[PDB]
Design a protein around this ligand. Structure first.
Ligand SMILES: O=C(O)[C@H]1O[C@@H](O[C@@H]2[C@H](O)[C@@H](O)[C@@H](O[C@@H]3[C@H](O)[C@@H](O)[C@@H](O)O[C@@H]3C(=O)O)O[C@@H]2C(=O)O)[C@H](O)[C@@H](O)[C@H]1O
Length: 543
């Protein structure tokens, strides 16, 4: 029984990931990682040898959705109540006067001391990148505190409201400026600014402002959310429709002297490394490379499709922008023959098997940019895009991904010539999610029966020592694992209650800083992502 499995999983989390450092007066906070064998909680090791237990609430927002979903479907209110208690404790103790929380890329809470920590010395700042926190829950706990966060988020990350210069970093303790009442002057594509308008951060701004509109009817918030979304659409290639990862370029204020020094103050990093051979269109925003294309055609897509639907008539532009970009990506970059995307520049330039001729931001000289497999996260965005626009081009990509992933043939069109593989070994939560989307739009039973198979596979192979892990050899389980989320989405569909589980937008959290190695030296730019990829007996590799 899949609901029984998720219930026991969340019970394990609330046992093994809980505050064990304050006696019989624990906080409601949770450790991000637990070794499921021993119950050892994942720790950050600071330069001077001090150990903190990593509690980063930005990295627990899938769990929060899982806890809410489990309460809804099972009728047991303890998981909802605990998630509310965690939210409340963060507004109570870990929200600064500006509204910002001690979470995100560079701040977390030590579960042992309950103090906010900052692992990155130079960057004691607020940062969210494809995080998509569960704002619906936060609003239900404390709407004023949530609203204060979202406004303080925009206040810190918009450097210049006139031109919408944005940054992935935001300073704590800033006073409130003109915010939504700021005057706007639309600038031409790729104007030069200090702030780097990466779409991973841009995603979080758009999403948060839209949720402030959703809950408080804040028209200022919706105006700016849509305006920011449009910033990423206006510089799209007029011929290809591809792009963009950012809508500004780094302002050059020093002349570069070394290729491997890729600080943004030397100017656009793609123009440095690609400009001599490719010309003016080699710009960061135009580099349709692996990772960037997930942020653009997965994370951004999932959020904007759901937002576009929510807004009814005024969401029609959003839906169009979103589906058009997915079409362009499928048209130019997708290789039907082997289920790959081509590394590309947004001008339509194919970069497949290109050898980098000098060092730079995108790799060392001699690095070869290769086609990369279209992952199951893309199956979701193409399945969802097709649901609103039944284009065979969108169906082609979904069909190609599924086939490559051991799922069989989903058909020539939904319900036509379907030969899915009911004996699949696929245990990918992303694939489960996308099959549930395919099922919802078409009501073709085979898609949901395939989703049931993936769920059983998840339970059989990824449910280990009461946790969910992508491999049986992994040292630590992540309490934010999406395996239980996909299992609950399936339960909700079968029970005819899809609204019992929050819509899945493929958000996730991360922590980054200096991490003290076992030889006493500092490993700069260490991510908790790297810690969750370690197997038993493996140590972090010098970077
Ligand atoms: O594809 C990858 O390798 C990753 O993209 C990640 O973000 C990139 C970059 O790799 C990070 O180092 C980070 O870079 C910024 C600045 O560009 C850099 O000069 C320096 O100042 O560090 C910065 C930082 O924020 O740490 O961010 C960019 C980005 O596009 O966000 C991405 O976060 C990661 O998950 C990989 O997919």
């Amino acid at each position: 029984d899949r609901l029984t499995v998720v219930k026991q999983y969340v019970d394990n989390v609330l046992n093994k990931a809980s505050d064990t450092y304050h006696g019989d007066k624990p906080s409601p906070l949770l450790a991000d990682g637990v070794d499921p064998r021993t119950g050892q909680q994942l720790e950050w090791i600071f330069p001077d040898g001090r150990r903190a237990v990593l509690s980063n609430f930005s990295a627990q927002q899938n769990l929060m959705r899982v806890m809410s979903g489990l309460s809804q479907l099972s009728g047991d209110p303890r998981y909802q109540k605990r998630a509310e208690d965690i939210v409340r404790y963060h507004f109570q103790n870990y929200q600064d006067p500006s509204g910002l929380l001690y979470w995100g890329g560079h701040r977390f809470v030590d579960l042992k001391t309950l103090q906010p920590e900052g692992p990155s010395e130079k960057e004691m700042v607020h940062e969210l990148k494809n995080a998509y926190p569960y704002y619906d829950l936060m609003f239900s706990v404390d709407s004023d505190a949530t609203a204060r966060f979202i406004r303080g988020f925009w206040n810190a990350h918009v450097y210049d409201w006139r031109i919408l210069e944005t940054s992935r970093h935001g300073e704590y303790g800033k006073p409130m400026g003109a915010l939504w009442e700021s005057k706007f002057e639309q600038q031409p594509p790729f104007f030069a600014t200090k702030g780097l308008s990466f779409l991973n951060a841009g995603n979080d701004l758009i999403y948060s402002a839209s949720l402030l509109y959703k809950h408080q009817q804040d028209q200022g918030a919706l105006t700016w959310a849509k305006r920011l979304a449009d910033q990423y659409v206006l510089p799209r290639d007029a011929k290809t429709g591809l792009g963009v990862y950012q809508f500004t370029q780094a302002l050059k204020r020093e002349e570069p002297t070394d290729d491997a020094d890729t600080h943004s103050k030397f100017g656009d990093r793609a123009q440095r490394q690609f400009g001599p051979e490719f010309g003016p269109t080699a710009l960061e925003g135009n580099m349709m490379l692996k990772g960037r294309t997930s942020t653009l055609y997965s994370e951004n897509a999932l959020m904007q499709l759901q937002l576009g639907k929510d807004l009814g008539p005024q969401g029609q532009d959003l839906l169009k922008w979103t589906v058009d970009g997915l079409k362009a990506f499928a048209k130019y970059a997708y290789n039907d023959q082997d289920n790959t995307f081509r590394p590309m520049i947004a001008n339509g330039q194919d970069l497949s098997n290109y050898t980098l001729p000098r060092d730079g931001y995108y790799g060392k000289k001699g690095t070869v940019l290769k086609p990369y497999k279209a992952g199951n996260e893309f199956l979701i965005s193409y399945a969802r895009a097709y649901a609103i626009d039944n284009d065979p081009l969108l169906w082609k990509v979904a069909r190609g991904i599924a086939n490559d992933q051991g799922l069989g043939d989903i058909g020539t069109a939904p319900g036509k010539e379907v030969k899915v593989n009911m004996d699949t070994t696929n245990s990918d939560p992303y694939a489960l999610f996308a099959l549930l989307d395919l099922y919802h739009a078409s009501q073709v039973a085979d898609y949901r029966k395939l989703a049931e198979k993936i769920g059983d596979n998840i339970i059989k192979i990824r449910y280990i020592d009461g946790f969910f892990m992508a491999s049986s050899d992994r040292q630590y389980a992540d309490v934010d694992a999406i395996e239980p989320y996909a299992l609950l989405a399936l339960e909700a569909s079968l029970r005819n209650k899809p609204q019992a589980v929050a819509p899945f937008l493929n958000g996730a959290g991360f922590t980054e800083g200096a991490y003290r190695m076992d030889d006493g030296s500092a490993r700069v730019s260490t991510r908790d992502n790297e810690l969750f990829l370690l197997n038993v007996g493996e140590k972090l590799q010098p970077n």
